[model samples]
Target: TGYLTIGGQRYQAEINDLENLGEMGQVWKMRFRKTGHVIAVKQMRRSGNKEENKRILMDLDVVLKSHDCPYIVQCFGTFITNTDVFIAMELMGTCAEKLKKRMQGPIPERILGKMTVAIVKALYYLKEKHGVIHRDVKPSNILLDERGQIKLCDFGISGIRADVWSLGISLVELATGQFPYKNCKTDFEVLTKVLQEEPPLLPGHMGFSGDFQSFVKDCLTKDHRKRPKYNKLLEHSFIKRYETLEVDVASWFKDVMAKT
Candidate 1:
């Protein structure tokens, strides 16, 4: 194909097929025709149906409302096709979930802690400014550049304390090299385990500091009401110490890329 175009001619599809993104929508690497800048493109489908239109509108507009924060993904532009809405976002080379596969074991706890700080800052931005709840906050939704820069992405307004809870789950996996549910053979088993267990921690014996363990513990209180939100987590020693750490995420990521 010479080139496929969408998103009101602002973008040209770099590949013919869109990558199914998440539970809904699709993505393709696209080029900004006017500027020749490469950008990641997301197409969220919307029908004449009201909810579909509403959700697509919300996804596009939500980022704008929550755009002021430094660690959130930047939406370069948006355009609507007849049945699909397109979002042009800054390209991130890897997500925490993707990075984990390249790692043979738990990554440095310092990096994990720093990543948590970015997630909290992003969650706080969405909460304080837009009255939005990010129901989903996991490693896949967390994007990173080569420079050790990280950001939280893909917000969908959702359950009480759900955002922080999900991040706590992700941090657990990041620090231990396995998902919190790894020991279970089924979702039901995993559910029963967490429901009956003391909130999952980063294994106090893993050499993690007391402060970091407490940070994860607060995020995971059995009662959602007891769970810590972004503000509470922001001041935790975990976040306080790593928010501006000078470590190099890019180098770590680049090394993985080379091997892969």
Candidate 2:
């Protein structure tokens, strides 16, 4: 029997394993005791750092503002414990990275295109509505559900420029089944290389569309000032081509799980 408290109210939930959400905080799969509704709960401890506290407060504002956005993960509720804060959100089938893991190799351009469209739309929505964007645009932070829909999650930090770079890096990883900075032995080295070296490119031999190649190249532009904004990206052929096509991603996802 486990429970969490917020305000003067008590919510008993069946807690599951801790899923570390990278830099943000510990997250758990939780189920409401009374209704049996399942949700993902991100827990942040009450810390002394102002930056961390600022993020916690900023996320709540984004969460509320993001309610109407279909591409952004929906927030279910929020709570505060004696020493930690909790945020409940829509539970998805798994993260996008897991899909890459179950695959034999790189994702197909058709499917990847659909996924990118959704992610870009979500990023654009945040920038348009909140004048901000997600700091992490990696595959893991992009969530996928059984319906084959891809949604962006985690918005505690903001930066559209760096976010574009991160998205390009993620695209390289997703397209090739390896992180763009895989040679780097440490995070520091990766950061250093990211800043110093030319941005990673989608492999030419992979035979991805010219539009797709240009899209990624634009995203990884060395100068942040030259990076195309989210709205401009929506008009890119890579997005425009896939947005209208009826890609059977739901069936594709079922195939992935079947093979898993």
Candidate 3:
């Protein structure tokens, strides 16, 4: 109950070196003594204008319910001060983007495939039961616990069709260890390539699973009008493969964490 109060907040923590930093926002591994809560705190600067301030928490309102979908990141609570707003959220052992970076070489298909299903399952949950779309579906926003448990985060820009396309892009990124259209030097080039009828590709020197390729292919379908529907993509062979296997990605993730 104390989590929602904005004025004269007493919660305190020490700001440590940040894992992620940008003009968009900054995050720190916060150590809390008041409640013994070690939280990942994100600081989103307030806009100078007053009216925009009132609506600032609209997206967080959606995040407030993240605990409802354990498949996605959980927002512990919001702590507001006069100059800036702080959001305390459940911490993750690793992120897909960071995990990909931590790996010594190309990530194993089984592991990457596991990541795909995790993203989709969360996105699917957002679209189906919650009536929302995660406009941003990238490796960076996909947070994983040490045991490979994952939850999609950063819903401020989320929406339906756009979210679906972004997920496809993320799928391709994981398979190739690169984001879509990474070869291009300019935004125009990336935009041009992304809109092409043919989906992106890996060099001939590379190899990947058929089901994985097919999954990403459909995800990047050129024709937005004909892009695979959310529910339909859920049934793809790539996602279904995990049904028979007993791969504990958590174990794999924890193993990887130990190395890095």
Candidate 4:
């Protein structure tokens, strides 16, 4: 197999050795030899359907045209080799799942607050600026930079007017570090819960304030119409308070670490 060049940049990619190749297709962390920048490449396996190929291109176009946001993944461009369709995009530092696992316990309140704001900003951008809905908003799809700035990636299943129900489930996963109501015995059980159940209240022992708890509750509401829009969510007192805390922490850390 030979290397492929796009936009005058040559990428050396191999099927077997790429980092983080996902399940549905092959994903790679590759570098542009010309620019010395790393990018993530998602190559779709050949499925022999021309329509599938067109859809991938359409998705790529949607991503590429999107304006840059602090919390949204950057899509560079796409390429096609004989056997696969490749999507090239900026490489993210660490995904949220890895960070949560490494923390060893409940995440620090300040860090969690900052992360919440970042992802909510992403949701706002996707819904308002791009008119695209992020259908799969899970921990695995949320990536962070070295400075802990968030970027939401993996929009393969997303499009305009996506299913808000699934997005609400993702919010709960971020808050509790567990899928609270998903593992039921039967389809009936799952449906009943999805349609009728409320998320279990955060334990009283948890340290979050009442307002913060309320924000999570509103996000997880079963009635999509009752759920606050992302703009309204940004304006919530809980989010604003957390934003202030994030700024204070950043300043304190910078001052202490400046000499180092």
Instruction: Give me the candidate number with maximum TM-score.
Output: 1
With candidate 4 superimposed using the best TM-score fit, by how many Å does residue 128's alpha carbon deviate from the native? 2.0
- For each candidate, the alpha-carbon lDDT, in order, equals 0.71, 0.76, 0.66, 0.61
Listed in order, each prediction's TM-score against the native is 0.81, 0.80, 0.78, 0.72
After TM-score superposition, the amount by which residue 30's alpha carbon in candidate 3 deviates from its true location, in angstroms, is: 1.2
Off by over 4 Å in 4: 1-25, 48-55, 101-105, 160-168, 186-188, 247-260
Cα lDDT tens digits, model 4, 48-92, are 578766666666766666645656666666656677766776676
lDDT of 4: 0.61
Error of 4 at 185 (Å): 3.9
Q: How close is candidate 2 to the true structure, as a TM-score?
A: 0.80
Error of 4 at 24 (Å): 12
Q: Candidate 1's residue-wise lDDT over 1-260, tens digit each?
A: 22333333534443333443342215566655545566677766664568755675676677766556778877766655667666767777777887888776787888887788888887887788877778878778888877677887664532233567777888888889988788799878877877887777788678998878888888887787567768788889888778766777778778877887
Which residue runs of candidate 1 sit more than 4 Å off their true CA positions? 1-25, 46-53, 155-161
**Pairs that clash in candidate 4:** none
**Residue ranges of candidate 2 with Cα displaced over 4 Å:** 1-25, 47-50, 155-161, 195-198
Q: How well does candidate 4 score on lDDT at residue 228?
A: 71
User: 70-114, model 3: which lDDT tens digit per residue?
Assistant: 677666666556667777777777677777788845667787677
Q: Choose the strongest candidate by lDDT.
A: 2
